[PDB]
Amino acid sequence: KPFMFEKPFGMRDTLPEWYKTKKNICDQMTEEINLWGYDMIETPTLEYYETVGVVSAILDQQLFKLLDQQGNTLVLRPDMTAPIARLVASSLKDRAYPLRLAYQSNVYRAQQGKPAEFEQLGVELIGDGTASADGEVIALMIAALKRAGLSEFKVAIGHVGYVNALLMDVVGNEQRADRLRRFLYEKNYVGYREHVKSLNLSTIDKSRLMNLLSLRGGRAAIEEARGLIQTEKGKTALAEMTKLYEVLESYGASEYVKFDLTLVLHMSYYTGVVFEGYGNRLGVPLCSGGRYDELLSKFHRPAQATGFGVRIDLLVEALNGHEQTCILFSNERRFEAIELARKKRANGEAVVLQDLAGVTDVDAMSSNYQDVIYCIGTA
């Protein structure tokens, strides 16, 4: 039997000071998000595993699974994108597109000391397939992060359509293509090069595959990328990339981004632009997003969709106490003190109204408050 103080593995408390810090950060971001016309929603803590859980971008082994009392397998929601897809296909079909939805919700991972619960904040833009839409979600993410106080960070932008078009044209085969994509997904670039060299391909085609690794940067990277693939799918992806970069320039967010066409966030979940953001002082992405045009179809309501999610705990970490007044009073002066407090609260000042008879150690307490007012004893 656990001691009274024990919490299940991966569970964490949020103490007062950390709560205020996190609340201010999130409030800044949701305020920005509302200015761009997104409406906040909520979904249930629990979803079915066999519907929502399996279509989530989170890998099966990372899902928090449980049995309910009737033997169904549920998940504590791994993400907000699939629940939102379910919500949209269910109760928002009468609402025409494009839909702009937002969330700030706890999500969950299988217990493993990595956190099994953490707050995630983000948006989904559904029913708009344009590059203007891809640009909008990235620019909003950038704007929200800045408004949160994160001044140094970098968003890397990849493209599933570009990668597929190049890989398929070179190796002509989905199995061969996935083998290559697997190295990119694991960020095993050395492994990728060696694998390319082992393939039954002309050296010219090997160079095309090798040159994918050099497609990092801005306008000059796009130009280099044009040289590797000129099929129709390649051209479409390339046009989307060109338009997106221009849109981001128009938003004034170009300096925060770079293309990296080696970026693979998932082996199959995303269908177009994908992106990941990092803070200057942690080799872990604190945010990510992308276009996922096949998800809504799975809920019987086909639509293009794109969005982003930000990990709040990682953001708070990448970024980085009683400003209250206490009125201490004796019983005989209760009204006097109640009126003092009422007055100051009416003025926006936080006030703890404290009966002297309810505190054992007065000094220990006066040191937990910015200022102390005494209404003690006899008037």
Added chain:
Amino acid sequence: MSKPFMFEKPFGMRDTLPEWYKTKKNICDQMTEEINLWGYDMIETPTLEYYETVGVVSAILDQQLFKLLDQQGNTLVLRPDMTAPIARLVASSLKDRAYPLRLAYQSNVYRAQQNKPAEFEQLGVELIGDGTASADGEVIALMIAALKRAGLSEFKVAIGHVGYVNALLMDVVGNEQRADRLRRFLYEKNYVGYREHVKSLNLSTIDKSRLMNLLSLRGGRAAIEEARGLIQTEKGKTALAEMTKLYEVLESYGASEYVKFDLTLVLHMSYYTGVVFEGYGNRLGVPLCSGGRYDELLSKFHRPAQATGFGVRIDLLVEALNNGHEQTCILFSNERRFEAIELARKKRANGEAVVLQDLAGVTDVDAMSSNYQDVIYCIG
């Protein structure tokens, strides 16, 4: 077993659509703002607690707990309430913060899926380590001020006392088991059964009348006076004294108009130890909120303290109190994209919510442009 259909949600779960979300948010933000003005600090605790520790000491009945097994075979609960998790927090993480502590929360809590929602948002406070009438009055006065700031009007907070009930019942039936049987009728608000049971008991004529007259102790400040005649034990006189001083404190807060007394009130068979209360809107129905003293909980976490507080059921409050796209929409084409972005950039700077929409991305522009308060075209 076959897979659920794609639209199916686990039993007792509910989505929160955009309009309901905004309404609930405004309400909660008003309450949390008042709460902060009284010196309470918001915290959060995990979604999962151990059953054998927090689960069991919760005020929520065992049959109502949402239990699950972890992958180690341990039983966890989805948190049934915030009071027991806050007690855990207080005795551990915050053990070196001296009493009294004033903590607050706005959190989803969970109930076992029973053929009612199994997940719902609750907001409230705990004031721990202050046993004064000042503290009793404070949490009730804060609740009233928060309810008011959220827009609730003409409501009532009914105040009972566990000590009064227990002293009277005991003094008459003299047996813990006999007293329980009576308390159960009150807990289930079954006066009919209660009257029937009292007349069945082997009691004198004055004693049946005492038990009987308890049911009448429901009204204004006067009710406490009539309560004095039913029991004169020390424990009974003490409970009555706490209620009288409590009323005096509420008067000082100018909260008196909102309070009434219901000495039949039993919120729980054992959990509450003293003053108890519940709030009702002017249309009655189910209580929107409730609270009271729970002076033995912190001891179970090895940091004994007196404690009180309240909780508010947010969904019930939203109901008791009562679409549209306020947003502006700028529709643009390629050639005027820079213009539209700057236009939107400018409006957003003045707190104007703007949807900036590439016309190439809209399937039905008439419907869209119809559903936003204002529409600007940067086309051409």
